[PDB]
Amino acid sequence: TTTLAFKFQHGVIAAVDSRASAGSYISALRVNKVIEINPYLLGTMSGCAADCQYWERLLAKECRLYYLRNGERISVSAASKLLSNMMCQYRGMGLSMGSMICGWDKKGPGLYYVDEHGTRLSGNMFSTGSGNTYAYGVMDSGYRPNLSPEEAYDLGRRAIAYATHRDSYSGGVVNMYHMKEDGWVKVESTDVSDLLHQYRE
Amino acid sequence: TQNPMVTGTSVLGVKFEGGVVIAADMLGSYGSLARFRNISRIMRVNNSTMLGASGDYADFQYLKQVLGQMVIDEELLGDGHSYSPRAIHSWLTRAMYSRRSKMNPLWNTMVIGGYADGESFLGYVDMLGVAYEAPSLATGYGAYLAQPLLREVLEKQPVLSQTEARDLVERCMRVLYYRDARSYNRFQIATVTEKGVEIEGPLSTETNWDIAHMIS
Amino acid sequence: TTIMAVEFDGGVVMGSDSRVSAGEAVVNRVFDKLSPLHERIYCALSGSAADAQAVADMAAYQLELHGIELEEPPLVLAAANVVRNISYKYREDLSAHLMVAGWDQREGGQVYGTLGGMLTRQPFAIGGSGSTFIYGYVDAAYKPGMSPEECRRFTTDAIALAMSRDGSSGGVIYLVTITAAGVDHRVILGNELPKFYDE
Amino acid sequence: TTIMAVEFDGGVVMGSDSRVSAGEAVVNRVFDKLSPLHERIYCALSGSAADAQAVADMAAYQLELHGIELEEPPLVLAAANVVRNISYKYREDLSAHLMVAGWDQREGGQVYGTLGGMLTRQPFAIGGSGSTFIYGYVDAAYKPGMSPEECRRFTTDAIALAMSRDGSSGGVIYLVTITAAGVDHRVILGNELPKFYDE
Amino acid sequence: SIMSYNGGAVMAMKGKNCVAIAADRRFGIQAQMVTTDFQKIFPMGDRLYIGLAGLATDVQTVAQRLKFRLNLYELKEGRQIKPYTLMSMVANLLYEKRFGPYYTEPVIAGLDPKTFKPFICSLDLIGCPMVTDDFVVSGTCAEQMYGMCESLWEPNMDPDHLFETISQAMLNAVDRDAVSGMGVIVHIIEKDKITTRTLKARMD
Amino acid sequence: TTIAGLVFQDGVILGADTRATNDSVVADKSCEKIHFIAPKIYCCGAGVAADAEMTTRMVASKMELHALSTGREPRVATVTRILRQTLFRYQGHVGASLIVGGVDLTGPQLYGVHPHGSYSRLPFTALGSGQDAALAVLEDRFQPNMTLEAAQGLLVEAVTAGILGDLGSGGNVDACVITKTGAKLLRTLSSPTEPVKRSGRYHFVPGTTAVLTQTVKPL
Amino acid sequence: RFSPYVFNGGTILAIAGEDFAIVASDTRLSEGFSIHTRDSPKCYKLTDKTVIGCSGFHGDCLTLTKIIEARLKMYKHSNNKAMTTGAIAAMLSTILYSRRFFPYYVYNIIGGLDEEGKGAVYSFDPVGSYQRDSFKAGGSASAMLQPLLDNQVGFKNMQNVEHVPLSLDRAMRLVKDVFISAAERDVYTGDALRICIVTKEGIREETVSLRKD
Amino acid sequence: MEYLIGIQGPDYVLVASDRVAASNIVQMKDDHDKMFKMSEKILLLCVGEAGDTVQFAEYIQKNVQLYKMRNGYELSPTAAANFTRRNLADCLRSRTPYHVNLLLAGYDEHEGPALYYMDYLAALAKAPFAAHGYGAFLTLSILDRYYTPTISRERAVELLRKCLEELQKRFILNLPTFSVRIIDKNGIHDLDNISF
Amino acid sequence: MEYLIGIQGPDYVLVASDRVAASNIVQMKDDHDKMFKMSEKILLLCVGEAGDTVQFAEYIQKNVQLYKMRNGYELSPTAAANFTRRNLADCLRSRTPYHVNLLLAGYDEHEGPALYYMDYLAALAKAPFAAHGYGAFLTLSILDRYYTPTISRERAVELLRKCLEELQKRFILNLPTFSVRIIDKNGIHDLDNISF
Ligand SMILES: CC(C)(C)NC(=O)C[C@H](NC(=O)CCc1ccccc1)C(=O)NCCNC(=O)c1cccc(-c2ccccc2)c1
């Protein structure tokens, strides 16, 4: 698994691959890795799967309780911070959860990273998961905050693409959303290897 | 009970037309030693159920006191509802399982047989919560030596007259005497039928050693 | 495993159970634990059955070369010195125990103990895992100056006791009486083992 | 440690060695391993001497409350059910073994075995680390229907055998004969232990 | 597992006078795909290929020592090595390292030099020669190949159906594995010609 | 791997399954186990398959060379002796639990030699993982002086009980009848399993496989 | 060291069509090197629309199915309607995860009909982590049956083949032929086949014989 | 820590390495050279556990020079790579397990340039470009994004400064200056060390 | 890794830290802030195992703010340092061992400035200057060479750039930009981030 996200002039696009591998074996290879919490929240997943599914779904339960109580559509700070508390409670209990909370709040596009330990980071460019570093390399050399949505999308497909090309634990299809001002919209769920042949010729 | 102090050997179970019969030699070991040579490892729970156990023996007596306590509490009501063998089997499955869930496992491998409503039940419950019915069971090394004999014969004849079953149990126990190191020529045979639980024993096993003069 | 030897006037008597067990299921329910080293020198094996066998064979080889080269039957003390040397030189690699017994013109019956590579003549030299259950009986029933039948029925009783209690011992009881006449190999079937208090 | 009990017609006889050793040097060369639980119910301790003592005291407490509350001497089966419960409930924490023996109007002499938390009446219920050396003797010399002197000289012989071989057992041999008359506490000094084959 | 350090699985399969040997092409350290043209199927004659699998260094070392002993054999003899002879040779060679074993699990596929009878065999990492009649596999993803081959194989398939069968076997079998794939190579071994084919595998 | 033996009036008879697993997966379906030692002395193989193969093959060579040397039949005492010295020298690492059998001038002799070197003559035995069932039925039905037919059906009951009653031992049973006259390798005596057919043809027309690169070499 | 998990083998299988959902498993209940029983079907009828498989540690299969059915009657009591397959899937995810620290070691595969009468199969893992697939194997022989189900059902790596909808019969012959392909090779698969078909009409049960050796 | 890198274009091999030899927190040396001139047309790039690198790779250097002095010509780079592969494999299970990762970049007059990889387990694999160290995890995807088989050596250096600038931005270890040599039919050309 | 540093002159405290929050090879963030404004005149500098830092130090921040809202005034820096010392010590043997190294730089209107150290075992020790991380092993001797009790804050910044330039030259980890704040009677002054 390799999962990245960056933000620019026109919002935040989060791209995730779609293979889930039990050790050396490929359990399923069209997994959906990006749990959609609200109409305009977005949290990815990585590491041991059940931790991301349970704790991030539960995160959606907290956000829904908030939105019913205060009626004011919980922000990204409270989201990543609250999931940060769910993780920080079970410190060192073995939870392997590396995830990211994308969204759009009153202050603007808030991109956060929430680690199994309790690490919590705003930022411009992230890339988690077993093949994160490759996505770093192919994102940076080819990142600039004046990218239009098209060049952004192609940049994501290049990032997750080569990230699953050199990696063993990553592949399948690439999901890539576009967290715009009025909420996310799924930009593509593209095959990977076909991309790599479109990029090798 | 992480470690076994006084274990028993394999128990044998086998159905037959109109009742179930099990055997379990009366030995209780302590390591390689055969310390206790006259302990019975087969309980009568009521008119329609009778139980066996390899493995740790102390926990077997805990399940005797608890289990007989349950059936006595239930006989107290006098409401006509008594635990069929399926209920007792499921209960031991749950107690054994829960004790496993606490990592305080009862080190038994029990084999509950009973006969209620003309249907011969024969259960199995080992320490870890495994459970199932079967026409022929054998805990311990009995699952290695006597088990192939029983599934061989039942394969040859899935419905057995009572005496044919009894000879099959006697002959399996002959094999266990010859080959199982923790065995001993002193075993009970329990028969549960329409009439009720009858525990014959201590029995013994004739043994042949003609091969002992063959080596030359 | 319960092998036993006894010294009486004309010779010895080497009883031994006839089971070799692998863990909790037996592999061989008849196994002669008395392999000859010469015409009148038996070694009662125990422990690692493979290791005991290799020691019995090597010892038989050296005892046979030394046997022919002198042209006279090798004294039992010689045999227990070669089995003692081979059991001591490899003591980290052999879990063997060999109560080597026999007869010889110069000394008569002998039963040398060779656990761990040591050498000690003894009246009755019982060994094996079941031997830890019959020390009481043998101490209570051993009287020096035993006639041969007393030795044979004696060791049969003792190994019978060990067989009833021990799991590492069962089957039949082999008995051989080594004297100036020769070896008299006998077998005790499970229907003939003298019954003791069974409960 | 070698404690032993025997059942005969009028009552029982609880022999026991009198050494408690710490590793290879002894701590106490005289120690009564027979602590009364009631007027006529002794428990022969073994294993963790501290644990066995705590077990004997708690069991004596419950047996005394239950004793007075019924206003009748508590049956031995009661006692071995309370010591059985306390030995089973703590079996991961107590290395104890308590051959609880005694007398009672309703059943006469009894000797219940309670190793590991189990309950089994037996004719002679020997225990302790030295008990692994006298199974042979007791099996060869036990005949049901023993007169009291036969039981006393018998257990004295048996524990004598265990004392000669075992390092965990030595000293004097305590003997008590529990019957309807009462307890008859006796001691066997080291100069009176019946001598057996010593070599 | 030392075997799955590089990953990769090779199978052979027997037809009607032609045995086809496959292999994946992903030379990778544990999770890092490093190379996509790593050779695993080393020829040992005009019609005899010995596909190896496992740790890379034992792949190349066993292949090169085997080619050593095989050139010495063919020179010192007057003949190409018969497949059964080659099998006993490789089994001897792996077995000389009985306690320091080469982590290679070779499969040998080829034809008789004279009669041209099909031949295969797989071996374990200490040399238990296991001649078979339907197929063999070897490597980190053996199980998927046992499924696909055991379901797809049929008696007496000519070369072309053979390439279809072994094709789909390798494709499906490696796509469900993480540590293998990155393409597939296939060799058909007829009586008269030898076709090399690489396959379109998932590049991810 | 469930191999067994037996001894009757005329000679011995060795059994053997035909399966060999790879740690969870049935690798072979027709692996041989009654190997060759001398013209009438056969050696079954259990345990580490590579080590039974190599060991019994080496000893096969020494008995062939010896057999030309003495100008005589090889005696099974020789085979068992070289086998257990070879096995003993390695200190049990060579987990090759042979069961060697044959027919000498002394008579039919069914030895059994375990991985450390401990051999033991005996009239019936069964090694391997299915030694439980095989020992069971052989214990239950063996008799001194059996007919060769009763021996064949009996051993087949034994190795059969191993086949059905064990995991790592399946396929067909192989029994080899040895007698003073000679050896007859009764390959694939019984075949309990029948699952050999199917009902789903899985064919793909040529062209369904996407080929990238190609080449052909004439020979 | 007391070990609380043992691999009692036995493989399950589940497929989803346009209107049905088969679930199948072998009934060999192996352990170590023996066969406890050649009959212990690993599919448990949960409701009229939901047939749940369980492989792996047999004890946790029993406990887990018992807990599930208890939760179904709790749900039916507090809500006056049986759980759909969706709810059963999510609830079995929180059951399997609420023991995240001492797992239920039981590969579930819940197949059944959602409220739209269409197939749905929720393959799980021992610590929760579910998903909805169109086909799935699990247990001992998952690795030998999964690729062939990709092939004849997912039609992957094919060229010039019409991706025809999965018909009930062809799904049947796929199930039986693949379990035979496993019985030949997997040691833990065999001795029977328990194929349960799910449709709007109820649950019809079908069994098949396999290799016993 | 230590980062090799090598790219193989039409007619050359542009290898680059880092110039730090650390001791557990402190760069003891920032002018160290990790490229060992085998012969007129063969560079050897060794990184890994200290002691193994210098000892091993100088052993290979001396064997190659010996070959040239024995026979008047040099090993073709395939031969040298399979040779070092022989020693590293034969020493893989031996008394002295050398933990070195290599790249033996070379150019032959006949076969053309080739860039041999080698993990520390003696796995040999010709590749059009490679890397080592943790910096490989941040650069190889960059080379994949920008590599083309007909890349010109100027474009090669531009690419290589994109990779190395990526290390200076993102990679965690202080790697300040990098050695960079090119190899063509004219031999070795010690090009200008990249700094930051 | 993470490098705090603090110097305490006549009337201030000039603390500086690094701005990297890594994950095992890659700087995931180069604009992270390790200085947590306690109150108007108290900075808290926390480094160490992730999760412990933010959770713990925000706990301390909230208790201090709570104190000010309860009583209308702020904790004197001695009181705050001994308070965080209380929680870290009481949590040292508890269910939650927080592995944080601190420096709670402060200036009181009365007692003057003081720079409290704290290893992760709750050992409190006022010092005229301190450090953490492996970079302490390369800077504290520099501060010893250049420190003087009457150092002016300009001279303080000059010194501090000598230390940090030493890290950029010698220390092994890529620490590119450093936060630097000063504290005097006028409160906190977010000074210009040092880069390289
Ligand atoms: C394909 C299906 C639907 C079956 N799930 C698994 O196999 C899940 C898969 N989980 C397991 O095998 C459980 C192994 C396990 C055994 C015993 C105790 C604890 C765990 C797993 O995730 N293995 C790699 C770790 N996790 C991931 O690599 C990962 C990363 C990002 C997302 C996901 C993911 C989450 C939900 C759905 C799909 C994917 C997984």
Short mmCIF file of N, CA and C in Angstrom, two decimals, chain A residues 25-88:
data_model
loop_
_atom_site.label_atom_id
_atom_site.label_comp_id
_atom_site.label_asym_id
_atom_site.label_seq_id
_atom_site.Cartn_x
_atom_site.Cartn_y
_atom_site.Cartn_z
N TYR A 25 1.05 -12.73 0.43
CA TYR A 25 -0.07 -13.14 -0.39
C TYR A 25 -0.98 -11.96 -0.65
N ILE A 26 -1.51 -11.88 -1.87
CA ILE A 26 -2.40 -10.79 -2.24
C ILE A 26 -3.83 -11.20 -1.94
N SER A 27 -4.38 -10.67 -0.84
CA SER A 27 -5.71 -11.06 -0.43
C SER A 27 -6.77 -10.55 -1.40
N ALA A 28 -6.81 -9.25 -1.62
CA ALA A 28 -7.71 -8.67 -2.60
C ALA A 28 -7.01 -7.52 -3.28
N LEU A 29 -7.33 -7.32 -4.55
CA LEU A 29 -6.60 -6.35 -5.34
C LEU A 29 -7.50 -5.37 -6.07
N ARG A 30 -8.69 -5.10 -5.54
CA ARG A 30 -9.46 -3.92 -5.93
C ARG A 30 -10.15 -3.33 -4.71
N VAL A 31 -9.42 -3.31 -3.60
CA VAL A 31 -9.88 -2.76 -2.33
C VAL A 31 -10.12 -1.27 -2.44
N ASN A 32 -11.15 -0.77 -1.77
CA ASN A 32 -11.36 0.66 -1.60
C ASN A 32 -10.72 1.13 -0.30
N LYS A 33 -9.68 1.95 -0.40
CA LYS A 33 -8.87 2.33 0.76
C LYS A 33 -9.25 3.67 1.38
N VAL A 34 -10.12 4.45 0.76
CA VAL A 34 -10.39 5.81 1.22
C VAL A 34 -11.80 5.88 1.77
N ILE A 35 -11.92 5.83 3.09
CA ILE A 35 -13.21 5.90 3.76
C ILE A 35 -13.72 7.33 3.67
N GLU A 36 -14.92 7.49 3.14
CA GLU A 36 -15.53 8.80 2.96
C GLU A 36 -16.40 9.08 4.18
N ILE A 37 -15.98 10.04 5.00
CA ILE A 37 -16.66 10.30 6.26
C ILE A 37 -17.88 11.18 6.05
N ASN A 38 -17.68 12.36 5.51
CA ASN A 38 -18.77 13.30 5.27
C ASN A 38 -18.89 13.61 3.79
N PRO A 39 -19.84 14.44 3.39
CA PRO A 39 -19.86 14.89 2.00
C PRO A 39 -18.57 15.58 1.62
N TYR A 40 -17.92 16.26 2.56
CA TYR A 40 -16.62 16.85 2.29
C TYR A 40 -15.64 16.64 3.43
N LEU A 41 -15.49 15.40 3.86
CA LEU A 41 -14.30 14.93 4.55
C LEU A 41 -13.72 13.78 3.76
N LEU A 42 -12.55 13.31 4.16
CA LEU A 42 -11.94 12.23 3.42
C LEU A 42 -10.77 11.69 4.23
N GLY A 43 -10.82 10.42 4.60
CA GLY A 43 -9.72 9.86 5.34
C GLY A 43 -9.21 8.61 4.68
N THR A 44 -7.92 8.53 4.39
CA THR A 44 -7.40 7.33 3.75
C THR A 44 -7.07 6.30 4.81
N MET A 45 -6.38 5.24 4.40
CA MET A 45 -6.03 4.17 5.32
C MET A 45 -4.74 3.47 4.90
N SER A 46 -4.10 2.81 5.85
CA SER A 46 -2.86 2.09 5.58
C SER A 46 -2.50 1.22 6.76
N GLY A 47 -1.55 0.32 6.56
CA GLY A 47 -1.12 -0.55 7.64
C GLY A 47 -2.08 -1.71 7.80
N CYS A 48 -2.23 -2.20 9.02
CA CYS A 48 -3.22 -3.23 9.28
C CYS A 48 -4.60 -2.66 8.98
N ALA A 49 -5.39 -3.40 8.20
CA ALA A 49 -6.60 -2.82 7.63
C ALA A 49 -7.66 -2.61 8.69
N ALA A 50 -7.90 -3.62 9.53
CA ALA A 50 -9.03 -3.57 10.45
C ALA A 50 -8.95 -2.38 11.39
N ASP A 51 -7.75 -1.93 11.70
CA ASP A 51 -7.61 -0.76 12.54
C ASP A 51 -8.11 0.48 11.82
N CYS A 52 -7.75 0.63 10.55
CA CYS A 52 -8.21 1.79 9.80
C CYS A 52 -9.71 1.75 9.59
N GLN A 53 -10.25 0.58 9.23
CA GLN A 53 -11.70 0.48 9.03
C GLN A 53 -12.46 0.80 10.31
N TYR A 54 -12.09 0.14 11.41
CA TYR A 54 -12.83 0.33 12.65
C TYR A 54 -12.65 1.75 13.18
N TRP A 55 -11.41 2.19 13.34
CA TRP A 55 -11.21 3.48 13.99
C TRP A 55 -11.64 4.62 13.10
N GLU A 56 -11.50 4.49 11.79
CA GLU A 56 -11.92 5.60 10.95
C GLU A 56 -13.42 5.62 10.75
N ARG A 57 -14.04 4.45 10.63
CA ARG A 57 -15.49 4.41 10.65
C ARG A 57 -16.04 5.03 11.93
N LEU A 58 -15.52 4.58 13.08
CA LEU A 58 -15.87 5.19 14.36
C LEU A 58 -15.65 6.69 14.35
N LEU A 59 -14.58 7.14 13.71
CA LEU A 59 -14.38 8.57 13.50
C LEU A 59 -15.56 9.18 12.77
N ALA A 60 -16.09 8.48 11.78
CA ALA A 60 -17.30 8.96 11.12
C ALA A 60 -18.46 9.01 12.10
N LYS A 61 -18.49 8.09 13.07
CA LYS A 61 -19.57 8.10 14.04
C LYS A 61 -19.47 9.32 14.95
N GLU A 62 -18.26 9.65 15.39
CA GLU A 62 -18.07 10.87 16.15
C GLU A 62 -18.46 12.10 15.34
N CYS A 63 -18.04 12.17 14.08
CA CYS A 63 -18.38 13.33 13.26
C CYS A 63 -19.89 13.46 13.08
N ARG A 64 -20.59 12.34 12.95
CA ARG A 64 -22.04 12.42 12.78
C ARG A 64 -22.71 12.87 14.07
N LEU A 65 -22.24 12.38 15.22
CA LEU A 65 -22.77 12.88 16.48
C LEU A 65 -22.55 14.37 16.62
N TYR A 66 -21.36 14.85 16.27
CA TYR A 66 -21.10 16.29 16.30
C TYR A 66 -22.08 17.02 15.41
N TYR A 67 -22.22 16.58 14.17
CA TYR A 67 -23.06 17.30 13.21
C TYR A 67 -24.52 17.30 13.63
N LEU A 68 -24.95 16.30 14.40
CA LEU A 68 -26.31 16.34 14.90
C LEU A 68 -26.44 17.22 16.13
N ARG A 69 -25.42 17.23 16.99
CA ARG A 69 -25.53 18.02 18.22
C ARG A 69 -25.40 19.51 17.92
N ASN A 70 -24.25 19.91 17.40
CA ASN A 70 -24.00 21.33 17.18
C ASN A 70 -24.47 21.78 15.81
N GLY A 71 -24.78 20.85 14.92
CA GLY A 71 -25.27 21.20 13.61
C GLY A 71 -24.32 22.02 12.77
N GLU A 72 -23.03 22.03 13.11
CA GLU A 72 -22.10 22.89 12.41
C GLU A 72 -20.96 22.11 11.75
N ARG A 73 -21.18 20.85 11.38
CA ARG A 73 -20.37 20.24 10.33
C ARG A 73 -18.89 20.16 10.67
N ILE A 74 -18.51 19.27 11.61
CA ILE A 74 -17.22 19.26 12.30
C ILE A 74 -16.07 19.47 11.34
N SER A 75 -15.08 20.24 11.79
CA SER A 75 -13.99 20.68 10.95
C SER A 75 -12.88 19.64 10.91
N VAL A 76 -11.88 19.92 10.08
CA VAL A 76 -10.79 18.97 9.87
C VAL A 76 -9.89 18.90 11.09
N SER A 77 -9.72 20.02 11.79
CA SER A 77 -8.91 20.01 13.00
C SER A 77 -9.50 19.06 14.03
N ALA A 78 -10.79 19.20 14.32
CA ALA A 78 -11.43 18.31 15.27
C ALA A 78 -11.40 16.87 14.79
N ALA A 79 -11.44 16.67 13.47
CA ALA A 79 -11.43 15.31 12.93
C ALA A 79 -10.10 14.64 13.21
N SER A 80 -9.02 15.20 12.67
CA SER A 80 -7.72 14.57 12.85
C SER A 80 -7.34 14.53 14.32
N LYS A 81 -7.72 15.55 15.08
CA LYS A 81 -7.35 15.57 16.49
C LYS A 81 -8.11 14.50 17.26
N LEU A 82 -9.38 14.31 16.93
CA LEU A 82 -10.18 13.32 17.63
C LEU A 82 -9.70 11.92 17.31
N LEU A 83 -9.45 11.63 16.04
CA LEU A 83 -8.83 10.36 15.69
C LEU A 83 -7.46 10.23 16.34
N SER A 84 -6.77 11.35 16.50
CA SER A 84 -5.51 11.34 17.21
C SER A 84 -5.70 10.91 18.66
N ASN A 85 -6.85 11.24 19.25
CA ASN A 85 -7.10 10.79 20.62
C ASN A 85 -7.49 9.32 20.67
N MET A 86 -8.29 8.85 19.70
CA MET A 86 -8.58 7.42 19.64
C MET A 86 -7.31 6.61 19.51
N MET A 87 -6.33 7.10 18.76
CA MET A 87 -5.08 6.37 18.65
C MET A 87 -4.23 6.54 19.90
N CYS A 88 -4.18 7.75 20.45
CA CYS A 88 -3.30 8.00 21.59
C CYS A 88 -3.76 7.25 22.83
#
